[PDB]
From a paper:
We present the structure of the DNA-binding and oligomerization domain of Redβ annealase from phage λ. This structure, resolved to 3.3 Å, was obtained by cryo-EM via helical reconstruction, using a C-terminally truncated Redβ177 bound to two 27mer complementary oligonucleotides. Helical reconstruction and subsequent symmetry determination of the 1-start helical population identified a twist of −12.947 degrees and a rise of 2.078 Å. A single turn of the 1-start helix contains 27.8 asymmetric units, each corresponding to a Redβ177 monomer. In general, the Redβ N-terminal domain consists of a mixed αβ fold consisting of five α-helices, a 310 helix and five β-strands, which form two separate β-sheet elements. The model of Redβ177 was reconstructed as a compact, solenoid, helical filament with dsDNA wound around the outside. This superstructure is stabilized through substantial electrostatic contacts between adjacent monomers in the complex. The outward-facing DNA-binding groove accommodates both strands of the annealed dsDNA product, with an observed stoichiometry of four base pairs per Redβ177 monomer. A total of nine hydrogen bonds between the phosphate backbone and the side chains of R128, W143, H153, K154 and R161 secure the inner, template ssDNA strand in the DNA-binding groove of Redβ177. In addition, the incoming strand is stabilized in a planar orientation through a π-stacking interaction between the phenyl ring of F66 and the purine or pyrimidine ring of the position 3ʹ nucleotide and two hydrogen bonds between R128 and the adjacent nucleotide at position 2ʹ. The annealed duplex DNA is also stabilized in an extended, planar conformation in the DNA-binding groove, which is atypical of B-form helical dsDNA conformations often found in solution. It is likely that upon annealing, the planar conformation is maintained through an induced distortion in the phosphate backbone of the inner (template) DNA strand, which is stabilized by a network of seven hydrogen bonds with R128, W143 and K154.
The Redβ protein of the bacteriophage λ red recombination system is a model annealase which catalyzes single-strand annealing homologous DNA recombination. Beta), a 29.7 kDa protein, binds to and protects this exposed nascent ssDNA, catalyzing its annealing to a homologous DNA molecule. λExo and Redβ have been shown to interact in a 1:1 monomer:monomer stoichiometry to form an Exonuclease Annealase Two-component Recombinase (EATR) complex (a.k.a. However, in a manner reminiscent of E. coli SSB, annealases bind to ssDNA, holding it in an extended conformation, removing secondary structures and protecting it from degradation. The N-terminal domain (NTD) mediates oligomerization and contains the catalytic functionality.
Numbering used by the authors:
A (entry chain A), B (entry chain A), C (entry chain A), D (entry chain A), E (entry chain A): 3 to 132, 139 to 169
DNA sequence: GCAG
DNA sequence: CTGC
DNA sequence: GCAG
DNA sequence: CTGC
DNA sequence: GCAG
DNA sequence: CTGC
DNA sequence: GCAG
DNA sequence: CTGC
DNA sequence: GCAG
DNA sequence: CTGC
């Protein structure tokens, strides 16, 4: 039942009145939950994403199905990129990199002291699946994503969201 | 049903009253979704593009059909080019390039510290399909597109859109 | 009974009216309480998390089932990251690390004297379970989490929350 | 009788109306009083914790059952960490440590003279139970907890709480 | 009779309406008076603690049953720690220690001259009972408690309480 | 990763 | 012209 | 740990 | 393409 | 002690 | 993947 | 003396 | 995992 | 003299 | 665990 009013209201938002809900629900469920996902897991992702204050369609927040029908949420690089950019006290940021590490420093206008975090590649890197992943094809970008996330967890966090 | 009122209303916007909807729907579906695409995937692209705040006809945002009838969205260089240009706090940008890297730095009026990102060609470049692509015929432009996108993800993101 | 109104109200918050509560309750219970958990233990986690002033869905606070049907609460790195960031008197922080220790110093605007704490790896590190954990794959990050928590216990604590 | 209205009111505080009180009371009793505890000992912990001005669910204050059905209260490191942090005259603190001692000095804004206390490990350390405790696995942290408590007993105490 | 209204009112202070008073009275009597104590001795401790201006539940003041049914009051280290900390004229304190003595000096804002007292271990120390006491396991702390008490008797006393 |  |  |  |  |  |  |  |  |  |  409830997924048909969600699919309908979302369609009505783009002016697409009177869709067949079943093919649309299925399409949308496989968009946010890539892979198999009970409707109970799909509606759980919608309420959890609202608790974080983040948008699932935009891929600001992911989730994957747990063993025994729970879910596991995962805030992405775009979720943290929202959180630091819609706060008025942010004052810019800078980075440093080499063959093995990345450093990221965040400044804010009210706080006198910048906050700085350093990440390390050989603990962040992942082995090839099975086969080729982004940790094989793009390593120097993939580490800089991780160092920004870890700094924004401390400089801002979820406080005020 | 709903695609015929979409095709009709869009036509009525250019003063083309009383079109035959079936040939127009087909034409329009193959414009935004290049290649085969269920109507459920086509109406999903319309609602997702509205969630990002971007226009599909203008190619600010693409999508491709997933395996098992989902979709995958892709914000293009014109989507980020909109997002940084319709924000009042943007204060210009500069670039640096060589045989192997591109750097892009974005300034904003309220933030004291510029934000700067660097991209690398030999991880961004793609192998020839099958046959000749833009990563064969235009490499020095194709990298500069990637470095602008990656910087605009951090300097602005989706915050306030 | 009471879990069905909780699951319902939470769904109504995301606009998902008239869900089947049983599959949703089960999904949600296994999200916050990973593993087996009586409904009496699940409702105990909800009231305890409110007493700390922290959110369970966001993983700011965990709990695990005790022997003889109690529970054990555990404030996480995101719980302390909230608490120091939603307080107006925080004035930034800095860190120091090596092969064996981490130091963290917290400043505040009203207090003249910074507060500083040091942690040590060979007492904080954990042995492999059974098999590979984060204390095997990520040690230099895992220690820095512990040193921030221990400092924030003294510089702020639960005073005013 | 009275425990069912306590369990009920606490549940009503998290919006969980109409719980079965018996499983909840049992769960809660085993949370605050770990181990066996008469209801008369459980309600005694609630009134004593109010006299100190501290919260039992948060583990700011513990108690254990006496021989002949009394109780013994124990203010924890988080109880003293509350008491020094919710007082306006606190002005920061500093520490010193070595192989055998810890010193802690507390400053306050109105008092001209700081107050300083020193603790010693070989009198504070405890022998292994029966088997491995925190006085085996974490000694350098476990002593620093004791030195802060002992200083805060003199610099603030219970005056004004 | 009177103990049931005391136990009741105290419970009503923590919101525990309609307790069985007999098990609660017994629990509370054995908390403040550890060991056997007539109800006449228990109500005598309550009125005497009010005359000193100190709280019995908090262990600011102890008592023990006399031979021939009197009582003996004993102000503790927390009773003196209250008395010097809730007085506005206190101006901090300092200590000196060695193998055999402890010195404590108290300053106050209105009085020009600090007051200083010295204690000695071999007269303060106690022999083992029967078996191991705090005068065996913690001697350097146990003496510093005695030197603070003796100084606070002269620098403040009960004047104005 | 989708640009020409 | 491609998507784990 | 989820990015391309 | 993965989750203790 | 619970993070990835 | 763990809790005296 | 109760912390992890 | 402990309390004279 | 009663603290842990 | 103690009180002349």
């Amino acid at each position: 039942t409830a997924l048909a009013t969600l699919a309908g209201k979302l369609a009505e938002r783009v002016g697409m009145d009177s869709v067949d809900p079943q093919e649309l629900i299925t399409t949308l469920r496989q968009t946010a939950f890539k892979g198999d996902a009970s409707d109970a897991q799909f509606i759980a992702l919608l309420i959890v994403a609202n608790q974080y204050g983040l948008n699932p369609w935009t891929k600001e927040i992911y989730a994957f199905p747990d063993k025994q029908n729970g879910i596991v949420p995962v805030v992405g690089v775009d979720g943290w990129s929202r959180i630091i950019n819609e706060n008025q006290q942010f004052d810019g940021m800078d980075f440093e990199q080499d063959n093995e590490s990345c450093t990221c420093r965040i400044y804010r206008k009210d706080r006198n002291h910048p906050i700085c975090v350093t990440e390390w590649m050989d603990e962040c890197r992942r082995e090839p699946f099975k086969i080729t992943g982004p940790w094989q094809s793009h390593p120097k970008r993939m580490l800089r994503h991780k160092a920004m996330i870890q700094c924004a967890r401390l400089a801002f966090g979820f406080a005020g969201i």
